[PDB]
C-alpha cells in the first residue's frame, strides 16, 4: 500500500495546486471525469440517459455531480449510492468594490468566506483563483483563471508596536480592518501606468487583463478567491504527510471522485450481477462553509431534481405503460439507498490534549474516521455505520487489503461544526454516514494529513460503492 | 535604478534562501567576501595586517566581521568607519532534550529564540538550518547544515473546538505547550526503523545523519534553527516587493556587506586621497534579538578587541619608536569615527493607523529610514544624521542618483525595541546613527519589503563609506 | 563516590556556617586558597607574576579571584579557563539609619537585598555577618564579624487576627512595614544601660561592641547581613541531602574553588604538556542578586583588568622586543578561552508540577544541570556545551568515575532570572556555559540540595579545567 498510497496522494497533489477555488474544483474534476469517458451533458438541453454510461455535469461551474447508470437497473432490487464531498474551502474571496488606497499602498479588501483560521492567512505569498466575467465584442465571456504567482500579501503587525512576550501579546485580528491584503504601492501603480470604474483596483485589473489578454476596461466583475501560491508537498522526515492548502474536502472530495472513477473502471473493465444494479452518484457540493443554503449547496433542490431527472430519463418507457410515477420509483429506491458524506475530521492534536475525547481519538495513518455526533451534526447512525464497516470487511475478503477505520466523536460539552451529511439525508430521505480522514489545522491555509488515510478513503468510497447491496441483502429486520 | 534595484534584490534573494540561520549567515557572507579577494584570517594564529588589503573573520562561525585597511592611514587625519547589521532573526531553535511523543506523534520541542510573531510560525512547511557537531573517528567534526525540504510542521488548532467567529475567537498561543512542531508519527518511525541517547529525537537524528552521511549515534548535539522552506520571491502585481524570511537584518546586513563590497571594489579599481585614509569595518553581529549580551553579540568585547588588534598590527612599527600607545591611537581615531547601524524599520501599516506617528511615517520605495528615538534606543543624534544626509548629497553630485531618506520616530507613548546602535556606540565610544529600510510584519516568518529601499540602503552604506570624511572635514564647531 | 560525595559536602558545610555573608565568603575562600600556597597579592602594590604559581586577591573584601599561571604559556596554543560563581545571596541587610522603637520594642529596619523568599525569613533565629568599620585611636579599623548566636527575630503575625483557614488566609508581606526584625524591648534596653548617634540602634551597637571589644561610640557604620543561626546539616532519612542557608552559589562557588584547588594540586603534584599551558582563573563575584552592576560585580571592569594585568605581568618581556600588545595577546587567547559559570538550578519540585518543563527536568543526584535558555539568560550554546560534555567523557576515560549531567531549560511562557554567564561573556568576549546543581527552594533562607550533585559539580569544574584544550584541539570547523 506504501506505493499505492503515495501514488494516490501524488494525483491528489496534482489535483490541488490546480484546484485553487471552487470553480477550478468543478473544472478539474469534470476534466478528470471526462478522461475516463463520461458523457458531459448540460442541464439545459434534454436528458437522454443510457444504461452502462457515465455522465458528468457542472451546475453553473460550482457544483460537480458525476453519476453512472448501471447496466441492469432493478426498480424492485436496486439502489442509489451517493458519495458526497463539497468542493470549496475557507478562503479570502475578493469583494466587488475593491479600491483601498491607504498609507500610499494599493489594497484589496477581501471578504472572509467561511469560518477559517484567518490569522494563518497573514504573511502568505497569496495568489488568485476563481471566475472572471469579461467582455469580448458584444458577448459576455466567462473564464476560469488561475494565477499561481504571488500577487497579494496580507501583512501582519510588527511585534514592537504592541506589548510583547506575554500570553502571545494579545493578538486580535479584526476581520474588517486588519484583513486587507496589499497588492501594490501608488508609486509603482502610477509608474507602470504612463508606460473606467473607480470601484475595481487597477493593480488588480491590470493583473487579470494580463491573464485574459484583453483591456482592463473589459473586465466587468469576478468571483475570485485568494489562494496560497506555495505548492502542496509531501512532508515529514519519511515524506509521510501531505499538506498544501484547501484540504478541507478538496482532498476529501478527490477521494470521493477517485473512489468513483475506480468503481466505473471496475464496472467497464473485466466484463457480478449486483454491481450493474445501482445508480452510483458522486456529487461535489458548494457553499458548505457558510451553511449550504445556496442554489448549488447541499440544501438546494439540485441533487433531488438530478435524481428525479435520472429516474425520469432512464425509466422513460416504463412510466407510460405500467403507470408508475417518479415519486413511486424514487421512494422505492430510497429504501436501498445510502449517502456517504466525506469531509475531513480532527486528528488528535498533541499540543491540545484538552480538546479531544478520551476514547474517540483520531491518529494519522490509523484509518478512516467515522464521525458520530450527539446532535446529528454528522449523520452517522450506529446501524448505518455497521453496514459500511461490513463493506470494508468484504473488501478485505476480495482484495486482501484491510481498510482501517476509527470512530470519531467530539466531546459532549464542546460544540462541533455541522456537515452536509444530514442536509442531503433530509433532502433525499436517504440514510447516511459521515466518514473522512483525520487532519490537523482544519480550516487553515495549510492543513496536514496522512498519506495512508488517502489510500483508506479512496478504497473506502470504492468499498461502499462495490459492496453495499451485498451487505444490505444480508440484513434482516423484525 | 529599476534594473539595479532588482539586481540588488536578486542577489539578496540568493543570499537569503542560503542563509537559513545565523551560522550560514556568517558562512555565506564570508564566502561572499572571499570572492572579492579578502584574506581570511583566523583569530587564533597571529595578525600581520597590510595596507590596501581586505580581511574577513567569522568569530566562532556566528559573528562575521570584514574590514579593509586603507592604503595611507593617517593617525592625525584618518577614521574608522563601521557599518553594523546583526546576522540573526527570531527563529524557533531546537532544544537539547527533544523527544516528545504525545498522541502517537513524534515531536520536537523548540525554544522561542528572540521576540517573534510565533503565531505566524504556525502552519508552515518548516525546515532546518544551523550547526551540527558530530563525531568522525576520534575527532569532533563541525558541519553547517541546510535542509531546504520540509521536515517539520507546527500545526494550529482547528477552528471547531473553541468558540468561533467573534473577536478572532480568543486565540492564545501558549509558548511552551502549543509551540512544539510535529516531525513524524510513531507508526512510520517504527516502520522505517526495522528496515543510544533517549533525549534526541530519532526522526530528527535520522534526518541529520542522512545529511551528514554518518550514523545517528555519531550526532552529539547541535544548534539548529527552524526556517521556512518557501523560497523568497518578488511579489506584488508589478513584482515590486520582496519577502521570504529572516528579513530582520539579514536583508539589512546584506546591504551592509554589499555596500562594503562596492566600496572595496571602488578602492581597488580605477587606481581620491581620503578614500585610502580610513579603516572601513563591516561587522555582522549575533544575538541581537535577545539583547546582545553574548560573546559574539554587540555588548561583547569582540569588536573592541578587533580594532585594538588592527591598530596594533597596522601600526606595529610606530608604537616602538615614537612611544605611542594603542589607547592613544584608538582615542585619536574615535573623534573621526562613526557607526552606521543598519536594522529594519516599521513601514506605515495601512491596516493599523493607530500605531504610527503622524509626521514620522515610513512608506515603501520612499527611502532609507533614519530612526530617531526618545530614549536613544536608536543611537541617531540630529547632528550625526546631518552628516550622513550630506553624504547622501555628495553621492548625488557624483553619481547623479538620489539617495532618498525619511525620518522615522515611534510614538511617545508606545515603546519600541532597542537596537545595537547604542550598544556598540557605548562599547567603542564612537558616534552613531540608526538607519534601515521600512518593512512590514517585522519579526515574523514572512516580512515584506520594497526593492527600491534595497537600492537606497546599498548606496546609503556606500555613500557613508565614501563621503564621510569629506563631510566631517567641513564641520566647524565653536 | 558515596564517601567522596559526603566528604565534599562535609567541607562545604564547614565553608557555609563560616560564610555568613559576602564578606566572609571572600575571607574564607581566600583563607582556603592560601592554605594550598597561593601567593596573596594586593591590587595596590605591583604585579610581578611568575609561572607555576597560584595567586589570590580579594578586591575590597567582596570579590574573590584566584588564578593559576601555567608553567609553559603559549600565546600561540594556550587558553584562559575561567570558572565563575558569585559569592552572595538574598539576605536581609541592615539599613544605615536603624533605630525603630515601636510598641515598646527595639527593632532594626532591614533592607531586602536581592529577590528572596522573604516570607521564609519570618520566624527565624537570625544572626549577623558582615563588615563593621570602627575607630581605634585615629585609625579606621575594618573587621569582619560573625555572630553565630541568635540576636534577631523577624516575627510573623498571629493567625487569629486575620481571616483563617482558606486559600492560605491571604498572606501579604509588605516589604517595608512587615519586614523589620525585633532585637530587644525598651525595658531591657534601659535595664541593661544603667548597669552618641541617634540613628544606630543601641541594642545593635551594644552587640557589635561586645564582639569587637570597644566602645559603642567607636562603631561608625557597617554593612551587615542577617543570617540564620541554624547550622547546615545532612538531611533526609539516609542523610542524603544538604541544607542550611545561602546555597544560591555559596555552595556552588565552593565547588568552583574546590574544583580549582584540586586542579592546582593536580598540577603541582605528580610532577601532561597541555595542563601547564593555560591560565586557570576562578573568580567569585559579588552583587549578582541585584544585577551585577557594581564595582565588584560581573559587569565590572575588575575581571577584564585582572586578565590584562596577568597578561602584562607574565608577558612583560615579550611585549618589548617582538612588539606585541595586550589586546593582541588577549584577543589571541580569547579564541581558546572559555567561561564556566556555576549557579544553582531549579530541581523538579514535586509539589509544583506546573512550573517545570516536561523534557528538561532536574532531579536530585542525577547530575550537573546544563542550563539552556531562550533569551540567553544562561550563556549556554549547544556547541559550547558539547565541548564540556566531552570533557566529562575524558574524565570518565581517566578516572573511571562518570560525571552525570542533565539539560535544564525553563518553559517558554515562564520567565527565568538571568545569571552572570552572559554578563562576563560579553565583558571578556569569551564563549561560555551555565552549569549548576539542582536545588529546591532557591533564594530562600533554607535551600535543600543533593550530595551527589556536589561531587559531580566539583569533578565537573575539574574536568573542564583539565580537559578543555584536549577537546578544543579535536574540533574542526569549516
Ligand atoms: Zn469541509
Ligand atoms: Zn533586526
Ligand atoms: Zn545564585
Amino acid at each position: 500500500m506504501d506505493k499505492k498510497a503515495r501514488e494516490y496522494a501524488q494525483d491528489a497533489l496534482k489535483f490541488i495546486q490546480r484546484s485553487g477555488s471552487n470553480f477550478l474544483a468543478c473544472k478539474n474534476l469534470k476534466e478528470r471525469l471526462e478522461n475516463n469517458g463520461f458523457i458531459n451533458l448540460s442541464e439545459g438541453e434534454t436528458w437522454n440517459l443510457n444504461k452502462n454510461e457515465g455522465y458528468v455535469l457542472c451546475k453553473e461551474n460550482r457544483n460537480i455531480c458525476g453519476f453512472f447508470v448501471g447496466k441492469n437497473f432493478n426498480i424492485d432490487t436496486g439502489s442509489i449510492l451517493i458519495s458526497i464531498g463539497h468542493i470549496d474551502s475557507c478562503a479570502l474571496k475578493i469583494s466587488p468594490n475593491n479600491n483601498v488606497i491607504k498609507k500610499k499602498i494599493h489594497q484589496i479588501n477581501v471578504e472572509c468566506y467561511g469560518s477559517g483560521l484567518w490569522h494563518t492567512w497573514f504573511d502568505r505569498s497569496l495568489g488568485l483563483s476563481g471566475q472572471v466575467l469579461y467582455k469580448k465584442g458584444n458577448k459576455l465571456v466567462e473564464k476560469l483563471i488561475q494565477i499561481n504567482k504571488s500577487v497579494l500579501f496580507l501583512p501582519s503587525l510588527a511585534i514592537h508596536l504592541q506589548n510583547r512576550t506575554r500570553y502571545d501579546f494579545s493578538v486580535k485580528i479584526n476581520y474588517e480592518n486588519h484583513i486587507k491584503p496589499i497588492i501594490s504601492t501608488t508609486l509603482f501603480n502610477q509608474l507602470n501606468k504612463c508606460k473606467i470604474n473607480t470601484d475595481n483596483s487597477y493593480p488588480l485589473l491590470y493583473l487579470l487583463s494580463k491573464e485574459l489578454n484583453c483591456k482592463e476596461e473589459d473586465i466587468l466583475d469576478f468571483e475570485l478567491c485568494l489562494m496560497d501560491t506555495q505548492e502542496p508537498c509531501f512532508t515529514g522526515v519519511y515524506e509521510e504527510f501531505i499538506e498544501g492548502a484547501r484540504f478541507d474536502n478538496l482532498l476529501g472530495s478527490f477521494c470521493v471522485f477517485e473512489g468513483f472513477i475506480e468503481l466505473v473502471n471496475s464496472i467497464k473493465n473485466h466484463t457480478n450481477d449486483n454491481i450493474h444494479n445501482n445508480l452510483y452518484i458522486s456529487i461535489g457540493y458548494d457553499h458548505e462553509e457558510i451553511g449550504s443554503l445556496s442554489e448549488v449547496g447541499a440544501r438546494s433542490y439540485c441533487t433531488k431534481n438530478f435524481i428525479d431527472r435520472i429516474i425520469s430519463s432512464v425509466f422513460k418507457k416504463e412510466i407510460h405503460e405500467k403507470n408508475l410515477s417518479v415519486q413511486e420509483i424514487y421512494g422505492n429506491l430510497v429504501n436501498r439507498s445510502f449517502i456517504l458524506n466525506v469531509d475531513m475530521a480532527h486528528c488528535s492534536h498533541p499540543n491540545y490534549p484538552e480538546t479531544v475525547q478520551d476514547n474517540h481519538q483520531l491518529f494519522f495513518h490509523e484509518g478512516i474516521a467515522i464521525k458520530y455526533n450527539t446532535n446529528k451534526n454528522y449523520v452517522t447512525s450506529p446501524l448505518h455505520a455497521s453496514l459500511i464497516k461490513r463493506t470494508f470487511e468484504l473488501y478485505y475478503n476480495k482484495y486482501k487489503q484491510q481498510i482501517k477505520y476509527q470512530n470519531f466523536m467530539v466531546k459532549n460539552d464542546t460544540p462541533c461544526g455541522s456537515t452536509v451529511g444530514s442536509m442531503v439525508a433530509a433532502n433525499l430521505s436517504m440514510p447516511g454516514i459521515d466518514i473522512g480522514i483525520p487532519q490537523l489545522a482544519m480550516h487553515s491555509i495549510r492543513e496536514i494529513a496522512a498519506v495512508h488515510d488517502v489510500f483508506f478513503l479512496i478504497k473506502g468510497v470504492f468499498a461502499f460503492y462495490t459492496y453495499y447491496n451485498q451487505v444490505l441483502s444480508t440484513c434482516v429486520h423484525d
Side-chain angles (χ1 to χ4, degrees), chain A:
Chain A
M1 142 189 69
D2 242 73
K3 175 102 204 69
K4 205 165 203 198
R6 283 234 174 92
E7 217 70 41
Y8 281 168
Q10 267 287 86
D11 201 290
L13 295 174
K14 264 82 146 163
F15 172 61
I16 301 102
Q17 204 256 334
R18 302 187 64 206
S19 186
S21 88
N22 67 313
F23 300 106
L24 287 96
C26 202
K27 176 188 167 192
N28 296 313
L29 278 170
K30 175 182 139 311
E31 286 177 341
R32 185 53 190 91
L33 287 182
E34 276 171 294
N35 289 172
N36 301 79
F38 274 14
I39 297 103
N40 182 26
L41 83 169
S42 173
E43 197 174 358
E45 41 202 84
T46 288
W47 281 25
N48 306 310
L49 303 185
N50 267 29
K51 303 292 187 70
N52 247 325
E53 305 286 288
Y55 296 93
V56 49
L57 68 157
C58 269
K59 174 167 171 55
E60 58 189 48
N61 307 335
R62 318 192 78 155
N63 197 296
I64 187 71
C65 185
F67 58 94
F68 185 80
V69 181
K71 184 178 81 165
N72 289 337
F73 271 174
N74 223 21
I75 311 99
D76 289 345
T77 80
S79 159
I80 298 163
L81 296 178
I82 303 192
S83 204
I84 288 170
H86 62 87
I87 45 155
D88 65 325
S89 44
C90 312
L92 292 176
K93 289 185 182 291
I94 288 176
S95 305
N97 291 357
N98 42 349
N99 211 30
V100 196
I101 304 163
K102 273 191 283 202
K103 300 302 182 199
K104 293 173 174 54
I105 285 187
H106 275 281
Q107 295 186 293
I108 309 301
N109 50 346
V110 297
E111 52 165 59
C112 294
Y113 167 79
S115 82
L117 281 302
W118 303 123
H119 74 277
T120 53
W121 286 73
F122 275 68
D123 297 356
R124 301 296 188 134
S125 86
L126 288 168
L128 289 181
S129 320
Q131 202 156 55
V132 176
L133 185 142
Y134 73 105
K135 297 183 293 192
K136 184 177 50 69
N138 50 316
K139 283 177 91 32
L140 295 174
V141 185
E142 273 268 308
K143 190 73 192 303
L144 278 75
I145 72 157
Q146 177 77 17
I147 301 174
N148 295 310
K149 71 190 197 81
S150 169
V151 287
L152 274 159
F153 188 73
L154 180 48
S156 183
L157 192 59
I159 204 52
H160 305 75
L161 304 172
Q162 53 271 26
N163 187 14
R164 291 193 297 274
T165 201
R166 294 297 104 171
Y167 63 95
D168 211 31
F169 52 83
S170 199
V171 58
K172 290 300 170 301
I173 299 303
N174 200 21
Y175 279 176
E176 168 65 317
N177 288 352
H178 305 157
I179 306 183
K180 268 168 199 157
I182 72 179
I183 199 165
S184 165
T185 62
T186 59
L187 189 68
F188 277 16
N189 195 37
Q190 278 315 302
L191 195 147
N192 232 301
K193 189 177 271 195
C194 55
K195 62 180 68 180
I196 305 191
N197 53 342
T198 75
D199 286 294
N200 262 316
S201 183
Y202 192 77
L204 186 54
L205 285 200
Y206 177 79
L207 174 64
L208 317 180
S209 71
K210 193 53 73 56
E211 180 71 285
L212 299 177
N213 200 291
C214 66
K215 315 285 170 251
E216 315 101 320
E217 352 177 29
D218 291 287
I219 317 291
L220 292 199
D221 209 296
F222 38 80
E223 186 161 8
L224 283 179
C225 316
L226 266 59
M227 72 176 186
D228 192 17
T229 50
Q230 202 187 354
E231 301 94 60
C233 65
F234 286 115
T235 69
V237 174
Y238 312 113
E239 273 207 356
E240 83 183 83
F241 300 112
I242 50 169
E243 45 170 275
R246 293 161 258 124
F247 276 184
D248 186 29
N249 217 345
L250 192 65
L251 169 74
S253 71
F254 174 75
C255 313
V256 175
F257 282 90
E258 194 72 32
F260 183 53
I261 277 154
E262 289 183 1
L263 174 73
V264 179
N265 284 317
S266 81
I267 294 172
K268 297 179 305 194
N269 298 59
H270 206 41
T271 66
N272 65 312
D273 289 330
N274 58 297
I275 196 144
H276 307 306
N277 225 333
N278 308 319
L279 178 65
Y280 312 99
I281 308 177
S282 191
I283 177 158
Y285 279 113
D286 210 28
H287 292 128
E288 183 263 335
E289 318 288 335
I290 60 189
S292 286
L293 203 56
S294 203
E295 70 265 5
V296 289
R299 299 176 144 272
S300 176
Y301 198 69
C302 61
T303 322
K304 178 61 176 65
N305 199 267
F306 285 161
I307 307 173
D308 288 17
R309 281 183 86 174
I310 292 155
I311 280 167
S312 312
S313 186
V314 168
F315 297 120
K316 187 176 216 186
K317 61 187 305 277
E318 84 157 10
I319 288 307
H320 188 38
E321 21 205 277
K322 60 168 68 175
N323 298 90
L324 267 291
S325 171
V326 167
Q327 305 94 6
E328 203 58 291
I329 291 183
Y330 177 71
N332 208 2
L333 303 172
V334 143
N335 189 212
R336 270 81 36 89
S337 220
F338 208 78
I339 281 176
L340 187 78
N341 178 34
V342 172
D343 190 62
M344 318 284 290
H346 308 304
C347 182
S348 209
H349 210 298
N351 307 326
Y352 301 86
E354 77 274 24
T355 73
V356 74
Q357 221 275 319
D358 196 351
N359 303 120
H360 312 81
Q361 301 204 29
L362 297 182
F363 314 102
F364 287 137
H365 324 270
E366 277 278 337
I368 322 173
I370 297 187
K371 306 186 284 180
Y372 294 82
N373 206 300
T374 60
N375 307 144
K376 214 72 69 169
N377 311 79
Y378 313 128
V379 75
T380 312
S381 171
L383 199 159
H384 295 111
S386 286
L387 317 179
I388 301 305
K389 291 161 188 172
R390 280 289 334 271
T391 63
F392 296 160
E393 287 299 322
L394 273 172
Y395 191 89
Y396 175 74
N397 301 321
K398 208 263 191 179
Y399 296 91
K400 301 302 178 168
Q401 167 61 55
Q402 188 211 11
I403 297 174
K404 310 182 82 170
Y405 56 93
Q406 36 183 354
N407 307 116
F408 172 60
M409 214 191 78
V410 81
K411 305 174 79 136
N412 287 347
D413 42 30
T414 75
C416 83
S418 166
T419 63
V420 300
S422 44
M423 275 151 196
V424 195
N427 293 324
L428 301 189
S429 174
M430 306 184 177
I433 193 180
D434 271 24
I435 71 174
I437 46 178
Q439 70 168 355
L440 288 171
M442 182 170 171
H443 288 199
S444 123
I445 186 161
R446 283 204 78 102
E447 314 158 90
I448 194 160
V451 322
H452 275 185
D453 296 327
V454 190
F455 182 79
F456 290 145
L457 197 52
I458 290 174
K459 299 319 200 176
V461 185
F462 174 67
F464 151 76
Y465 274 157
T466 317
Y467 297 109
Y468 181 71
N469 274 305
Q470 199 158 1
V471 179
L472 201 67
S473 81
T474 66
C475 253
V476 296
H477 321 282
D478 186 51

